[PDB]
Design an enzyme around this catalytic site. Structure first.
Site, PDB file in Angstrom:
ATOM      1  N   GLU A   3      90.919 -43.709  24.920  1.00  0.00           N
ATOM      2  CA  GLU A   3      89.666 -43.802  24.127  1.00  0.00           C
ATOM      3  C   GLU A   3      89.071 -45.357  24.381  1.00  0.00           C
ATOM      4  O   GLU A   3      87.685 -45.362  24.862  1.00  0.00           O
ATOM      5  CB  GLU A   3      90.118 -44.030  22.710  1.00  0.00           C
ATOM      6  CG  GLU A   3      90.351 -42.478  22.360  1.00  0.00           C
ATOM      7  CD  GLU A   3      89.157 -41.425  22.351  1.00  0.00           C
ATOM      8  OE1 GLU A   3      87.985 -41.766  22.616  1.00  0.00           O
ATOM      9  OE2 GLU A   3      89.599 -40.329  22.168  1.00  0.00           O
ATOM     10  N   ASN A  36      76.265 -42.085  21.818  1.00  0.00           N
ATOM     11  CA  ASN A  36      76.254 -40.867  22.303  1.00  0.00           C
ATOM     12  C   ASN A  36      74.764 -40.162  22.123  1.00  0.00           C
ATOM     13  O   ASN A  36      74.441 -39.950  21.041  1.00  0.00           O
ATOM     14  CB  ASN A  36      77.148 -39.794  21.488  1.00  0.00           C
ATOM     15  CG  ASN A  36      78.462 -40.121  21.542  1.00  0.00           C
ATOM     16  OD1 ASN A  36      78.970 -40.274  22.676  1.00  0.00           O
ATOM     17  ND2 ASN A  36      79.213 -40.458  20.350  1.00  0.00           N
ATOM     18  N   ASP A  67      73.836 -36.612  20.531  1.00  0.00           N
ATOM     19  CA  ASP A  67      73.803 -36.229  19.006  1.00  0.00           C
ATOM     20  C   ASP A  67      73.337 -37.423  18.096  1.00  0.00           C
ATOM     21  O   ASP A  67      73.466 -37.453  16.876  1.00  0.00           O
ATOM     22  CB  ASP A  67      75.038 -35.469  18.490  1.00  0.00           C
ATOM     23  CG  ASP A  67      76.073 -36.463  18.198  1.00  0.00           C
ATOM     24  OD1 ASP A  67      76.041 -37.751  18.545  1.00  0.00           O
ATOM     25  OD2 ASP A  67      77.167 -36.053  17.514  1.00  0.00           O
ATOM     26  N   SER A  95      75.119 -40.266  17.615  1.00  0.00           N
ATOM     27  CA  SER A  95      76.576 -40.921  16.751  1.00  0.00           C
ATOM     28  C   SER A  95      76.781 -41.986  17.845  1.00  0.00           C
ATOM     29  O   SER A  95      76.637 -41.914  18.863  1.00  0.00           O
ATOM     30  CB  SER A  95      77.353 -39.848  16.472  1.00  0.00           C
ATOM     31  OG  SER A  95      77.914 -39.274  17.620  1.00  0.00           O
ATOM     32  N   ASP A 146      80.613 -43.986  18.718  1.00  0.00           N
ATOM     33  CA  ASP A 146      82.117 -44.108  18.857  1.00  0.00           C
ATOM     34  C   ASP A 146      82.412 -45.627  18.649  1.00  0.00           C
ATOM     35  O   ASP A 146      81.825 -46.445  19.189  1.00  0.00           O
ATOM     36  CB  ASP A 146      82.738 -43.567  19.704  1.00  0.00           C
ATOM     37  CG  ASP A 146      82.352 -41.964  19.847  1.00  0.00           C
ATOM     38  OD1 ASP A 146      82.399 -41.411  18.735  1.00  0.00           O
ATOM     39  OD2 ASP A 146      82.493 -41.423  21.134  1.00  0.00           O
ATOM     40  N   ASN A 165      84.209 -41.757  15.514  1.00  0.00           N
ATOM     41  CA  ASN A 165      82.729 -41.107  15.443  1.00  0.00           C
ATOM     42  C   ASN A 165      81.733 -41.501  14.152  1.00  0.00           C
ATOM     43  O   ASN A 165      82.730 -40.867  12.950  1.00  0.00           O
ATOM     44  CB  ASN A 165      82.467 -39.803  16.029  1.00  0.00           C
ATOM     45  CG  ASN A 165      81.054 -39.558  16.217  1.00  0.00           C
ATOM     46  OD1 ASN A 165      80.599 -38.870  15.318  1.00  0.00           O
ATOM     47  ND2 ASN A 165      80.478 -39.775  17.411  1.00  0.00           N
TER      48      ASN A 165
END
Ligand SMILES: [Cl-]
Ligand SMILES: [Cl-]
Ligand SMILES: [Cl-]
Length: 130
Positions: free
Chosen positions: A35, A46, A49, A51, A53, A60
């Site tokens: 990650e 991102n 969409d 969002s 992380d 998220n």
């Protein structure tokens, strides 16, 4: 902060991650490695969409933490996403535990399926005293 491998392993063990809902420490290590490279301050937007992380486990904003700016989002960990950018990973660990209380468990993270699932992950904890 960027953890060293074994330092992180011991840190997670103290926070009760070893075997949490069936998930070995080496699985959590493999997740953090892929990650974030063990980096607590990482964020990844991102664009797809809207969002983001956050932090060492790249948790998220759509489901897990509030950043104010993700449409339609909820905050199941009941934290500011800011909490997931601390050097101290207690809040991130609590939130990771929350994620894996849901049906998918550690499968929630695609990187885990890609990089950890069905692999020999022993190397992540080798020599760490855990
Ligand atoms: Cl396993
Ligand atoms: Cl918070
Ligand atoms: Cl901190």
């Amino acid at each position: 902060k960027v953890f060293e491998r074994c330092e992180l392993a011991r840190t997670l063990k103290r926070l009760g991650m070893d075997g949490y809902r069936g998930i070995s420490l080496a699985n959590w290590m493999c997740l953090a490695k892929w990650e974030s490279g063990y980096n607590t301050r990482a964020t990844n937007y991102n664009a797809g969409d809207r969002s983001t992380d956050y932090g060492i486990f790249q948790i998220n904003s759509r489901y897990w933490c509030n950043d104010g700016k993700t449409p339609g989002a909820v905050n199941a960990c009941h934290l500011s996403c800011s909490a997931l950018l601390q050097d101290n990973i207690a809040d991130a660990v609590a939130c990771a535990k929350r994620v894996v209380r849901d049906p998918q468990g550690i499968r929630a993270w695609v990187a885990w399926r890609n990089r950890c699932q069905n692999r020999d992950v022993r190397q992540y904890v080798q020599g760490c005293g855990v």
